[PDB]
């Protein structure tokens, strides 16, 4: 078991979330994305919505562990287009990944809500890793693409769903709660990627979209940890 330390200037959350000049300390947010002291919502259920929320500030870790918890919500069974957790060289403030930037350099953990190539494998969600020359893509849920995946179906749970993902000695995990309880440490394993490289250097970020379809997308909070041995 490795240390934990809170690291308060990649994080954010309630019950003040949002500074009264509107802005959420140490994170610039891009796009739609609203912020309040509750929440942040990132993408709006109105059609083609982008929006993102990015760290200021590179971090520099060898190890990290990240917690995000959030709600996607919409009216429909089917619902676009989903949410995106950062860790990337450059900020990917804006941007057609959604709602970020593309051909980045680092790794994106996609929650995918729809299946874009029909295979009725969505939601998902997908680990993306990248060097800053791969196009993603959106019309086959990056299939192609992807380093791992699982299928969770993390819209409109009752609880607040949360995803922990962990980069230690190389190798990134994530874990779910698929918000089915009120229990906040209840997790499920999704997907991992061993051996893996990422930046020295990098922002965290959270993005979502929306097209055709779409769903409200919620982050209540974002928590980042340093990790050691
Ligand atoms: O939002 C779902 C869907 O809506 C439209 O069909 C397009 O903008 C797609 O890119 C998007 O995936
Ligand atoms: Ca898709
Ligand atoms: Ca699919």
Redesign the pocket.
């Known amino acids: 078991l490795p240390h934990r330390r809170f690291e308060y200037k990649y994080s954010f959350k309630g019950p003040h979330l949002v500074q009264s000049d509107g802005t959420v300390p140490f994170w610039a947010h891009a796009g739609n994305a609203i912020p309040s002291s509750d929440q942040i919502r990132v993408a709006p259920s109105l059609k083609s919505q982008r929006g993102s929320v990015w760290t200021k500030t590179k971090a520099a870790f060898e190890n990290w562990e990240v917690e995000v918890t959030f709600r996607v919500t919409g009216r429909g069974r089917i619902g676009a287009?989903?949410l995106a957790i950062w860790y990337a060289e450059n900020q990917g403030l804006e941007g057609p990944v959604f709602g970020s930037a593309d051909l980045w350099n680092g790794v994106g953990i996609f929650f995918?809500?729809?299946?874009?190539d029909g295979k009725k494998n969505?939601p998902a969600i997908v680990i993306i890793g990248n060097n800053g020359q791969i196009h993603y893509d959106?019309q086959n849920?990056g299939a192609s693409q992807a380093l791992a995946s699982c299928q969770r179906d993390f819209r409109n749970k009752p609880y607040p769903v949360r995803a922990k993902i962990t980069y230690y000695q190389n190798t990134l995990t994530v874990m779910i709660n698929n918000g089915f309880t009120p229990d906040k440490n209840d997790y499920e394993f999704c997907a991992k990627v061993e051996n893996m490289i990422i930046p020295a250097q990098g922002h965290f970020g959270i993005s979502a979209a929306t097209g055709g379809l779409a769903d409200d997308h919620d982050v209540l909070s974002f928590l980042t940890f340093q990790l050691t041995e």
């Not at 995918?112 to 874009?116: A, E, I, K, L, T």
């Open positions: 287009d989903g995918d809500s729809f299946d874009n969505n959106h849920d």
